[model samples]
Target: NINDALTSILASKKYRALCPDTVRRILTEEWGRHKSPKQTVEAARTRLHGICGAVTPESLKAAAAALSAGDVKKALSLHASTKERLAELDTLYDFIFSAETPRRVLDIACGLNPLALYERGIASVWGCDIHQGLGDVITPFAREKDWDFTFALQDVLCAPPAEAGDLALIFKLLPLLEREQAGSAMALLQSLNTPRMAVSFPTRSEANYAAWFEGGLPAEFEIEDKKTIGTELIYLIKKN
Candidate 1:
């Protein structure tokens, strides 16, 4: 049964917990390129690793509930990076807010950052992502908290937002975009409506990440400060 094939693909532990909508979308797209269901499954598996693989609907539910119950540690356990950075989150926020005290925040490809930001007393955040899984997690929590956080489905590569924010957060989104399209990061920066942008990347991915990131910027952008937390390198940049 083709229906069984669809269900069979989701049987794998990694793909099973994922939003069926995302899994089916990838599988259907892969099926178009590869005529065989087996090849489609293989391609879908590969595609799944990067896109929303770190998150699942089940974990998101628990994280959301935990955060609602005021269990910060349990809530941050949704992702490895979030858990790793938990101890140092205060410092990170201090570094960002001390210089750029933004009231409205644009969290591009937000993922689970908004949940962590809630623990830090950030009330206003506009988070957007391409995947439903991330949106599913943040939207409920924001509504529950009665906070002014907005999580919508907008693919940055397809349509970057025109709405302005006091600060735009580009955490770990640059490297992924650069890999997808060589000059995407710079183009995204130009399209963003914010004057100040906080962009970051994992230094372990490349030797000279600072140069790689800074090199991609246009003439109007200025480097305000740089900070390294373990392997995560962050830059506070501004556009004139």
Candidate 2:
């Protein structure tokens, strides 16, 4: 079944164009070993350097070095090629952990955000995403580095767990959720039981763009702090 599916993917113009033959061959071997189709695809994508676009293990290492040296901007630069994305991370780091207190972090829909936060000395992190390869990458990295980080393959659109943490991060994700399924954003936030949350939004958009929280936020939570840095806007919220 995986072989058939992978063959179809390799023959398709989309994946064929994106993934070279060598990568496809390697991916096929890995895919056969993996039981879940979703995981196979997710792992293939990451191994092929599709997700987060050019952030590889090599680049991540360089970013970690910069972060260790207390050069936040340099670290962000290594992770994101786009100026806007880099600026967004720069802003986000300041908004979330300027004082740099160590605490358990619940990183919902986390991409490379966990790596960034990890560099900032988070006590522990539970990074959740729908894609399994994100977990794969994190698991080994955490083990080798001796960091207390765990990954969960979860879809927030489904039944989100009653996540508890010192800080919950929902960054540049609400709009995407709203687009996929109306009211999903509010539902996810409401389900979360964290004491504090740092939410962010991109200032630029391909479609209609407006002020932050233009569509409105859930009434149950109130904003404690807000900041606009570079091309992103961040809000710190607490339950009312």
Candidate 3:
């Protein structure tokens, strides 16, 4: 009976959606064909990386080397590009917590890096990205450092409402999408009334993006805080 029930479940159309692809490889181990949970996790990791783009050994070595070399700037860049986004986020948080408003920080589309606030001594932090690639990097660091940071795989455009972040950071992304996607992204962000947000986009000749935030731009979204730093446009948007 158990065998028949298992067979029916496996044959269901929604099987893959209900159970991850990693289940098959995991089944192989359960059938006594393999050992080593580390190897099992590693095998699932290879398959996962196949779905996402592969990370190069050179890049891994470089990021690790930056950490070893103790060059903080290079270390951060090794995680993600755009020094301006990082600068704006770091400066923005410096102001927020210096005001001592709140302690929670949420980083959306957080990518493969540590959020700046974690380094700045904030204990409560959370991050989310479309990719789960950072499991091998960030999780271990959080455990080792005793920093209270958690990560999830999520579509930030449709981020859930439990997120009443003290400060929200969205950075070094958006130009990768078409115009409509960017507009919808802004609308969703404006819907969330966080105390502050640091958003970044690529600097371009056209100022079409201004139309997206015209009505929703909070009073604290300073006109002058928008600036062209190198190739990026950083918006230091804040609320009253």
Q: Model 1: runs farther than 4 Å from truth?
A: 1-41
Of 1 and 2, which scores higher on lDDT? 1
Candidate 2 regions off by >4 Å? 1-84, 87-91, 98-102, 206-215
User: How high is the CA lDDT of each candidate model?
Assistant: 0.76, 0.65, 0.53
Sorted on TM-score, highest at the top, how do the candidates line up?
Answer: 1, 2, 3
Q: Across residues 1-240, which tens digit of lDDT does each residue of candidate 1 receive?
A: 335556886787665545555566667667767778466777777787877635666777787677778776778777656777677887888888886577788998777778877766775888887656666666777787788888776667667787788899998788777765578778999999999998889867436778877776798999999999755788999889
Model 1, position 164: C-alpha lDDT score: 88
What's the TM-score of every candidate structure? 0.81, 0.64, 0.58
lDDT of 2 at 178: 78
Candidate 1's C-alpha lDDT? Answer: 0.76
Residue 71, model 3: Cα distance from true site in angstroms? 6.4
Give a tens-digit lDDT track for model 3, residues 1-240: 224333443454433222232334333443354464425444533434433223444554565556545454564565545244566655545543554544677776665546355577777777765444444446656676787888765554444435677777666544432331446555545655576766766556525655644554555455435655555555766665
